[model samples]
Target chain A: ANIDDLLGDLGGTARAERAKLVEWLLEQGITPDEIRATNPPLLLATRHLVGDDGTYVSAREISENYGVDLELLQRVQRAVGLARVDDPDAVVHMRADGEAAARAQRFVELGLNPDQVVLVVRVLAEGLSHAAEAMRYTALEAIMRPGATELDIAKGSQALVSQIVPLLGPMIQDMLFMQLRHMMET
Target chain B: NIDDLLGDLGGTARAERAKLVEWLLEQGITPDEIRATNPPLLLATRHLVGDDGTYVSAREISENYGVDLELLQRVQRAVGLARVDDPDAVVHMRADGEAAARAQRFVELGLNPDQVVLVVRVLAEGLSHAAEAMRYTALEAIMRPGATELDIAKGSQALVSQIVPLLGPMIQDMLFMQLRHMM
Candidate 1:
């Protein structure tokens, strides 16, 4: 159950090393069961990245700052089930938003139409939304039960979401290519 | 022989397909069940792989993708696929290689062998089954008489492109609604 025991079982390690490892893990409210659970990779791959709530900018500003096509960006945002970015002055963009816009922008650079890019984004958004929903349900289940606090559930969700977030790009990319190939073949 | 067992779910190269079928059997799928389900199962698998040359051995996959062969084997077993004695034995791209590549990504993300195995099992069992059911039940029903696998696959893709946006939320909505219903 202990990290020390788990790591020691892998190969003998000093107590200080184990304690240091434990300290780092504890700051995030992680557990040995979480790390060395039935399959740690599931959680590891599903982690969502955490940082400060990034600077918010308007959809218009995002287009100006990132050189993304504003209309195209809003189309994809709507396609992914979010509302269209109508208010040009609204401060609704974040660092992740810029990064995501840039990614879609690359598709345009590669000769795909804005509409085509939106289609790709729609599929990715669908799968990713499911992934987020799954994590939310898990968190809700944890929160609903008595023992864990809201903070506890939040931290655990953060830990789990951070892992999942990193894998989303790869997972979606693979699905896209595979599905396209199938489409092409048929 | 096993390709025949999977009801002529042809993949260009018969040997690798046999190995996959063998792996399926090892996972406890009876020959009779595979035979019974062959039509939709094969139909569901239609668009995933184009040719057999794309299939590669576990050894080659490890060398190409930088995955650990042993961990890959464990992932395969955990996902209910059979183990091959020879590293040179081949497996499918979507079925086996992609899963290994995914596990390697998690390993790179700091997941230990135990974790990769579990993650592989969840996706392998849950998502794969759901996708199979969707394709078999609904997607396959629209095939025209004398339609080729390739034709049906393209038709399905065309249909999916139109509905994917709606389907995404629909599934999630159904998920929680059903969750509430279950509760």
Candidate 2:
């Protein structure tokens, strides 16, 4: 609750679903077996957790219920190789079962259009990439805030801009590629 | 030109990295290299210095990284001109320095010093730090010497929130370190 903002916003339906889901999961323990047997998504089956009609499944609800630290998840995704973002030469490493895969599978379960999802994901990726750039720059800015000599200012700015060159510059390219593929399919 | 590196991308991670590197190395040159007393300054007439005397040190990094002068200018232009979309723009403009002049106008409107100070600090300290942290270090002389983590974190929240859009995934690594220490 302390990081309510970080956790994201959920409506009454999502909250109700969360309470039910958390209760059921804790009682049921952590086995993928039961949900897997159903063939349909756990998201769909778990809707009874939120609303009585079993019609309240949504990404926000699932994210909150599972407590899938997106911050941590994305960190792992970028580090473990779903897609190399912001770090261009760092090897575009992604296993078959990574965030990108999970996203694809979830889209299928929701009966969501892949094109729409890719569009959303690409936009979100671009936005997130820019956020990282700003955060990194702010760190540098604080260090150089004193009466920076003209040389210091120029040098600091150069060093700051240098890191972004190959790093983040290319990560967004992959994100865009996936988006284009979705577009072509549609 | 991170902005340039990203523009036109729909989310593709192509051979953009190679092209971006090659593009940056061709630009102007860094100021630290220019001003090292031991290294000696470039002559005023040197090709590196423009007519106005404002040094394009970032241009050097761009060139070294293989960026083109035209490319660097293009990237700068986009960042300079870009605006956030819709209702989001209100918040975006406020956070992105566009609202600075208007925010500061409150000072002229008879706002208290404490309130004025807070707003100005938000504008100056928030977005730019996220834009580039090393560009704006604080004065050691004014600090409490052993300031609490809360102190820095409080300062950073406004800053962090402001730049959330621009920092992207890299911050997941950076902020995680900070958050872990806090946790």
Candidate 3:
């Protein structure tokens, strides 16, 4: 099968674990169409794609660990185009949340007030959100094929995500650095 | 003072230009500065495309131009402008009227409203980033330590006027090149 070939290419424990999940789901009398309709690939690939090591934490923990006020942390998160966390104790955030909070704290130390930090973060978030949407659309178009089965889509998406997600950070950093240099030179 | 800035304009054109100049003065800008920096271009930068007395309401554009008012508003929103719910408000410029007329032609040419909006959304998002970058560059070129608002505005006026004329053709050429590359 195409999925078998893709899994073989993946190899190691990753391949075994994914095979087990599919086998288990199939043994439960669930069809691949049901799985495809649910889009489990996206859900299963989040941790791998986000590269946050599956370390989820509460908003309260992020605020406390990063030395940011809970309210301010929530405000910053909202400004970054994230949904409002009504309950600070909800364990819904990832390591990236804490990292963002930590960066906001650092910005405060560097003389930007809370509002100014939020403003800068909002603009960056807005621009990056559009970039992310475009990237997602293009990636889906590149990977998706006509009449492909659910397993084919799942394997393709996982492979594409694993390969491309890791490269995005360096790509963005390099582009930003080059743009800054150009701005300075001009 | 207003005469020096708007000497060529007459009637309601002169009156409307006077209002803009007075507003600039309220913002601590002077008539001499406005005259020096090209009043029409400055006004165009502030209020896009129509610097003269020609203004039309969204309702009027819908009635007179054969474009759906709702779709026109949606296009404006897609282009990142502030929401204008009141159709009777005379907020659209001459270029806005032209845009509505062109959009009507597109509809007559078989493009649906949603498809038009989707295309406009992509263009708007892309151009928004480009415009922001250009705005930053223009500001950087003129900004100094402790510059006044008037100084910034005057300097920006000159820089933006130079940039504005070149932007359309450059964007078109880039679009053509990208289309060719894709093909």
Candidate 4:
């Protein structure tokens, strides 16, 4: 039924455009029913902004490859507010997760204990999540309107997110340095 | 030296500094006295929290407002304040009493305790983070390589005084939009 709804929504759109969107959704493993339940335009915009490389790895794999303790890695993941996948072999971790685990391994090599490392990770995660929430509100405010069409939302959000996403890293770095300066002053 | 410092400020900073100086003088604070302490910080605090000098204990609020003691503590904790083991502790400000009144209103509107806690928690988490970021950003804007304590404090006071009043309506707009989306 959602597939039919989507098709009807794209009825006046070009055939190639409709096919490309369908293909993209299918490639990302999104089902039609999921689109019906959520805002498909925003979902597609989010994917395009974040970009999927079509690869995933398991927590076990990350732990083994990064040489971090499996239990510790799981703990850090939970502390960082990632979804807890109890199955070690489940391919739920992404490329970024592997990078994060590698950083955690580096922290261990720096002689910080697991508890201290998890604490730092949790604080950083909390702060960055808040920053992300603020940014999301900015994007939503820019693109949102009463009774907007799906394509309008998709295009507008994608354009705004693409412009905004690149600034996040630099902003975080600046904020970190400012905080460090404050800590040193006190 | 104070004259030199004030003169060294840029155009807008100089203007703002003059305004603060005039305001402080009007309140009977001498220039020498202002230099001894952070008058800007004091002014900012007074403006943000209002001129009410009295503080209320959590137990007082609970009893006077008919809010359950445990629920009041839970709400405070969710707002990221220090946990109070002593109910008689005078940790709440006038703003806190206003919050308690609002919570009582929520209860009057038929939201259960858990539901109220959940709502408070969500808003607190978002707003607290935003408030931190806003503070950082405001400070960053005013900070400079040879900036004096007075310079930074005064600039921050001005920026915060301007920004804080606009936040209430902005939060209301955001909340309405969010509720609309959820519905």
Candidate 5:
């Protein structure tokens, strides 16, 4: 499909905004061909996803706004395997990041020390990273089968991913509580 | 400040604090049994971290771990946290991260979400209630003259080290023994 046809298929926000996002994705090194080879709608849906205000905000702004420690916030970003932003004041967050830092601020509010917060971040990072790897590989195994084309595989993987995404948080939450309970028991 | 102070005593309000204390008294908890080092107080500390001591967002956890964001929130509700409108709200902790790892293993082992939830809920309820009892027993022994919170915790740690290794087998035997009696 041509670029406009592909862009038209991505159903969210305004037409101009969707077209702008296509340009934005290109700047991020994603090609139009890459969009077509995969599930374009899902790709666009992911890109179009935004925070509460629909504007990207900064790390430093998030820190001050949420009362989260800057160092802790950065460390959490690193721990979650997200890349380091050189500028603390750079607009690095959508609502997802804002809300994330807001949640991390709870440990601080609970009077946990820096070390405790770090420990929590490390566990979360490691757990999630592990889960991501496992899911991707599982999706890959299905897509790489003999009859599947690259497009089919990409579509399959994205479809599988969408189904799994909603379960990750709650499953982890429940499992973590069980682990802690078992650990505490032991 | 008042909230923080009240929070320390396991209450969120003056009336709530008074009611909890009164209830504890009615249940035969003495002043000495109400020290910061005591089991109820220890349990209070555990509960205090409920909503606020987490380090991850539900969105990221779902994305990172390949779970449903709604399912994760349902588990939160299952564990007794109130539901809110925003699904992106951050509300997971270190334990959540740890659980996610093990849960992935469970998923890999071919467990579906419903089965996973049932198994996890049973485990969580068992562990929490059992720990509650265990904490009281250990903390009660340490509540005598001159025992500080630190002392109680340290002593409790040692007690766990001794108890944990045996508790597994103890539980195993108890379950089997009960089954035999029922048979």
Candidate 6:
């Protein structure tokens, strides 16, 4: 519904952000069937444009730098069996890891090549914590900073801090840091 | 610097140094009566603290007890002055549990548990690493009555300022790249 209203003004960043909002809502224990339609690819694409080095251009003005549009995203969503699970009563499956692999297998049953699946989770997960914390601090800094009079870095702070708080939790931080520390130890 | 605070005690005469060391040594040692049965006073005073009120340092103590100075320092670090937190302890050196409750605020703000573990480790290192003088008013302010969110926010920024400066130019190269991309 938000997408339909903001569709014209929507940029990759906004769309990407909405995707995360969707994921967060889901994790808060809301289900896909309850909130329009959601899937790994939509989650993947949303994470990409918001959190990555991607550019954002409004849908009404020009295409995304990566040429992703809602329609293409819906295709990615449909490819992953996201729609089948959309009916309110259906039990949906989610993969915390290997989501892309499971997505590819799902696509293959429909005769699609697995490699065509997006390289997304890997993209979003990079430098996840440090970036989030820095954003949280800077956003807070912007509020009282000398020239922040006009900028909305207040939200800019929350935008990152929300992610940071979750990522920085003891078990969660360890989960992410364990990945990096393992590389060092290995 | 703390040595300066030690005043005449740290600056005592060699005989007085011997007395301080002997006092510091007898802090946790006991002399056996059998070892000095011949001289009597030797049991309490010769190796540990003499009747003259002078004490022995590690060199003399080592001769008396038969141990190396490095090993004695290790013992001193473990069981001597470093072991206790006097009522007037400095902020940086204060023990965590004994320090103001604000010390745990770092953990409350989602410092990974292992980071808390690292905090303890870094603190131990800080004890041996730096020995600058004593004032803790800045840390004490964190525990002040009616502390506001602004204080915590300011503290977070200060932490970031310290942290980011160390991240070096890579910070600019990376964050500015993202900032420009946002633009």
Top candidate when judged by TM-score against the true structure: 4
**DockQ of predicted candidate 1:** 0.05
lDDT of 6 by residue, A1-186 (tens): 543432234467656565455545455444455345323222222233233322222221211222333343333334332233332222232221112223222222332232332222122223332344444333344234453321233334444444433322332222222222222122
Off by over 4 Å in 4: A5-41, A51-54, A65-67, B1-183
TM-score of the second chain, each candidate in turn, equals: 0.50, 0.20, 0.65, 0.69, 0.49, 0.21
Superpose all Cα atoms of candidate 3 onto the true structure and report the RMSD in Å to 1 decimal.
14.7
- Cα lDDT tens digits for candidate 1, B15-134: 444554565566455676556443322433333333222557778877877878888667656555444646788754443467456666655644455645654454444444344434
DockQ score, prediction 3: 0.02
Give per-residue lDDT, candidate 6, residue A110.
Answer: 34
Give lDDT tens digits, candidate 2, residues A49-126: 211221223233333444443343344344323344544233232221232223433332333343433333343433
DockQ of each: 0.05, 0.02, 0.02, 0.03, 0.05, 0.01
iRMSD computed for candidate 6: 21.5
Cand. 6 Cα-lDDT? 0.31
- What is the per-residue lDDT of model 3 for residues B60-114, given as tens digits with 9 covering 90 to 100? 8888877778887776665544346678978655554545444444444333557
lDDT of 2 by residue, B1-183 (tens): 344433344443324432333332333433333333211111121221111122223334344444333433332333332333222222211112222223222323333334433323332323333222211221121134664333332333333333323334332332222211110
Q: lDDT of each model, Cα atoms only?
A: 0.49, 0.32, 0.53, 0.53, 0.47, 0.31
TM-score, chain A only, candidate 1, equals 0.56
The estimated TM-scores of all candidates read 0.43, 0.19, 0.43, 0.44, 0.43, 0.18
Shift of residue B130 alpha carbon in model 5, Å? 22
Better of 1 and 6 by lDDT: 1
Residue-wise C-alpha lDDT for candidate 6, range B1-183, written one tens digit per residue: 123322354333433434433433354333332222321212222221102223234444444444444433333332223333332233111121112122233434444433443333333332221111001211332234654333433443343333222222222222222322222
- Compute the DockQ of candidate 6: 0.01
In model 6, which runs have C-alpha deviations exceeding 4 angstroms? A1-11, A14-186, B1-14, B17-96, B100-102, B123-127, B132-183
TM-score, cand. 6: 0.18
